[PDB]
Symmetry: C3
Subunit: 444 residues, 3 copies
């Protein structure tokens, strides 16, 4: 609840603390059915515009069904099989003879129903749309006569309204080769999603968590097209199960740390690597290197462990002692002293080099801080913007406390002559070993 | 048809074989026309709601036309000119005086027609929508009187249905600066695409191939907005021509290969580079380094040669002898021993290091394999999942045969003291030359 | 207006000149309101289809309002706070008691109106849709009786037309966690955008610039959901302010430059780094490293300075003398001699190595140029395509003048034995210092 931050002047890095986890560790698959009409062409002597409008909407229904049939013949390998493997196993079961008859029997009287498939998966099925009932009762008497009977204009509008969701679902499944994410309101309405969450074999706090973050749940869910067979359209919705909840999470921010000599070509740089989200998980730390894999709402991070690395908990000691022997703190080295800034959760890191004009301003007071050459930091308390060169960044105005941990920039502990300056994935001990090797080649 | 796999224990890499190619090497451009109405405002004494609804839909038609006019004045350079250059050459021809009169004459009696343009391109043109006929015959008598005549509600609904495709096409062309990909059903319906494929100057197996993979064809096609001029809206659809068909294709998978000493800081790593899709092509190999450039359907890969590299066929010998003098097998080196796994076509590579808990399970039996430190592999036969640290991966359940090629991990052939450990783009011979240089600097 | 190009044979790089800048340096926020109906359920004895259709569309209105309410309770941190910080500051003001009453008073008589908020921001507000007027006057008398009165079918269609924009706006704000970019025509119609631009506190040439590039303006704008409160739906549109206009801009193109010895393993390579867009800006140069951050229309580049680096103007001297002491020209080194090509603004760079078949053709004449081993270039005058290996590239047919600046490839000035060949981010002086160090270790 209380967000705090710590800037480390020695390593030009900051850690944003106080975040709570929700890591996806499991999947809950659910079958969504649409009752279809196995209509055949019913051309009759037709002229008045209402029959034409009905026949037009009926052809749009007919093309949607044939499009789903060619879509289910070809199932592309191009999805990420490791993240849809559950639902794909259910679709392979659905292709069995008699399984669609089973779901067809369970949704015979109600819209929602639990169905035990023939593979040990107790899935929750839904009937979200009933087009066979509408077409066979309200439309077929209209095109199964000698001359077509005249339907009312209310029927034309209601049929375009009901048929619309089938057409949009066929559009999403067609452009995405049967696998869509996020899951749209066409695939599952917010009302249907909340009812599906409420009916899940999870704790009540987990139902409240997923119900209060339905948009994040949609962004971390998949919709997989199964089969169109025997007047039934079935597709699987894969919802995330957050097996890791309320564990401490923190975000590491890094920026280049160079020396600030006045003669160009004589400066060396180092930047901590592995910036991103860290969360405590089962005696280890789950690290998320890609920036788009974790959604934050309030102080809660919602990550997928599929794109994480598992690190020893000693990885946090790079934040307290980068020179600590329990974990080899990783860095990259260079000579690229271009000024830059990183907007953190509660402030801004500024790496100012060369002649760059770096400053921090308040909207009404003007410049309140001028950065000197090196790596520095400013909290969001009293600061609105940070300007670096010709770029203006805005500071996050979120409430919290920042702590400036003063310390000597560690780049000053290195003799420039023997520094390894172009290391793209090194470590503190890796650099020290390359330096020990250059001192033995130079002593003789 | 038969998918096979080979895991190389010596290099921590796997090759998935048996795939057939379809590489895009050409473009087939086609002109899609929409007959428009050069209507002018026709405000008359109007009150009843049906005239207002018609006038509202007519203004939505009017804004769509002016939006396309400002869209064709500004053609952004931001597209990738090298992949739309064909259609852009056709749009430059269409801007000539009299060329729209030519297509206007060919689609005078039929919907589809071949047109020889004034630049030597024999394009296939289509009339997919006729709004000038509908507006000038059914709507203008309704707003060209002293007082507007009253149109029936069927006319209001039919006009919103016909005008809809124009409005959606204007939306896609507006948000994408005139160049859209993939090509939506609004740009070209599946029925129109299949008819366009069938009418193409290609072999019958190529028409069957593109017709059975229409969604992949859409994802590898472009729609370019040409011109709105003289009651004609024209835009080019660029369809892929697969000049390379049924050549062997294979997918290389790589994972870090480190030594497993018990003292941290004493281990060295190496990873094969250039993982991805390889296809035999014209006496050479077409390599696709980016992961999203090749769509797989069944055992067929559909790539665009635009994002390929051409390599000598000897590049396959990195799979049989990484130490082979005909091709310099490329690697990258490091000391980053973080555990990870790679899901292949028929199994999983696991690089287990440190204290990470790596295992392979069956859904009902539990843990059936525990990986030791190093790089190892498991087939999908009897394995459902692979757990590495806090992450659970699912194995692809596709049928095929895997071959575990046992061999000494080549990282064990290197003396750690003189190994080059931070090489970001090296080669087997590059590393040996850096080692020969470190042994001459150490012998003295 | 006149686009020119310069190919540097010595460094295998080209510079496309003559482009004019438009850099985003500020934001103009604007409030978009939708007058809503605080209706409550009004179930009455209803049977005929017109009441059902109205009640159905009313439930779609009701769900859209509750979806926006749960959307405004949860505001995700996941947006990029530094680029939405303006609008977020306005939304925080809008959440104050009485501020929605202020905008509700200013849009009491007109659609557009300037409103001075209680935070010093003089925002331009708009009333783009009026659903409270339509529902309370045309719909409530239809469900506030003993038995529902019968509405005409025109009312059903007009209500689905008016309610549609609310439903689409709720869809975009829901899938994107309240922050959408680009800004759709649903968020702001082209007519409303042009009227908002015209009413902006900017010069007349800036109104003409943004009005002639509305699609680029949309792609560089943000729509942020604020609050739904007291029969008012408010959201902020953030439009770009281009503080840098008509400054010279140029695009740097680079390609690998290797030696062409006949014995593999004896060749060294070097590639200039920092390819992309450069624009003169306030006595410095704004560099844009990512490829998708700058949209080009004609000869004008539209960039966001948010994703730029500020460089000394001496960075242009890498184009005139890469060996020039005022700026340390950056390079990367390797031994990866794979053939490739780069399509420039007026031609094509070709790096041909090994046995690769590189050629340049005219559509009707055939092969007009065969590249030898090394880095070379061809203008678009007389050339249509460039083939490298199995890949065919199309040359941009834009009019301009190219200049081939002959010069010795600088890779030939380096002794291969002491060259640093795996540098991932080096510089000309960095390489010379590593060479000076290898010559001192070899002289003894
Ligand atoms: C470098 O030498 C020092 C001095 O003995 C030693 O303490 C340190 O551990 C060495 N570093 C490496 C990486 O071997
Ligand atoms: C390294 O030296 C050995 C021994 O003569 C030789 O066989 C090998 O080719 C050399 N490697 C390189 C890259 O020069
Ligand atoms: C390398 O040595 C030469 C010869 O004195 C000198 O001119 C040059 O500046 C040196 N380069 C570096 C990077 O120190």
């Amino acid at each position: 609840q209380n967000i705090t931050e710590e800037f480390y002047q020695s390593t030009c890095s900051a850690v944003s603390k106080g975040y709570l986890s929700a890591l996806r560790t499991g999947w809950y698959t659910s079958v969504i059915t649409i009752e279809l009409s196995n209509i055949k062409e019913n051309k009759c002597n037709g002229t008045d515009a209402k029959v034409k409008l009905i026949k037009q909407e009926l052809d749009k229904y007919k093309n949607a069904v044939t499009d789903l049939q060619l879509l289910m013949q070809s199932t592309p390998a191009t999805g990420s099989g490791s993240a849809i493997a559950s639902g794909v196993a259910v679709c392979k079961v659905l292709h069995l003879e008699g399984e669609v008859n089973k779901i067809k029997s369970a949704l015979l009287s109600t819209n929602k129903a639990v169905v035990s498939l023939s593979n040990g998966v107790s899935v929750l099925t839904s009937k979200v749309l009933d087009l066979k009932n509408y077409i066979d009762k309200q439309l077929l008497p209209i095109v199964n006569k000698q001359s077509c009977s005249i339907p009312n204009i209310e029927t034309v509008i209601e049929f375009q309204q009901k048929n619309n969701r089938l057409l949009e679902i066929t559009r999403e499944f067609s452009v995405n080769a049967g696998v869509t994410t996020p899951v749209s309101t066409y695939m599952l309405t917010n009302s249907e999603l909340l009812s599906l969450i409420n009916d899940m074999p999870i704790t009540n706090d987990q139902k409240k968590l997923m119900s209060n973050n339905v948009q994040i749940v949609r962004q971390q869910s998949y919709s997989i097209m199964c089969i169109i067979k025997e007047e039934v359209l079935a597709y699987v919705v894969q919802l995330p199960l957050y097996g890791v909840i309320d564990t401490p999470c923190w975000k590491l921010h890094t920026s280049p740390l160079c020396t600030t000599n006045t003669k160009e070509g004589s400066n060396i740089c180092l930047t901590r690597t592995d910036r991103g989200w860290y969360c405590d998980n089962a005696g280890s730390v789950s690290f998320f290197p890609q920036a788009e894999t974790c959604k934050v709402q309030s102080n809660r991070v919602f990550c997928d462990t599929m794109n994480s690395l598992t690190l020893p908990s000693e990885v946090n000691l790079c934040n307290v002692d980068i020179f600590n022997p329990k974990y080899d703190c990783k860095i990259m080295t260079s000579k690229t002293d271009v000024s830059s800034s990183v907007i953190t959760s509660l402030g801004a890191i500024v790496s100012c080099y060369g002649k760059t004009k770096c400053t921090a301003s308040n909207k009404n007071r003007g410049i309140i801080k001028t950065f000197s050459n090196g790596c520095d930091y400013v909290s969001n308390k009293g600061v609105d913007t940070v300007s670096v060169g010709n770029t203006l960044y805005y500071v996050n105005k979120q409430e919290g406390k920042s702590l400036y941990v003063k310390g000597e920039p560690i780049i000053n502990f290195y003799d420039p002559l023997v520094f390894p300056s172009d290391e793209f994935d090194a470590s503190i001990s890796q650099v020290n070993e390359k330096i020990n090797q250059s001192l033995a080649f130079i002593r003789k």
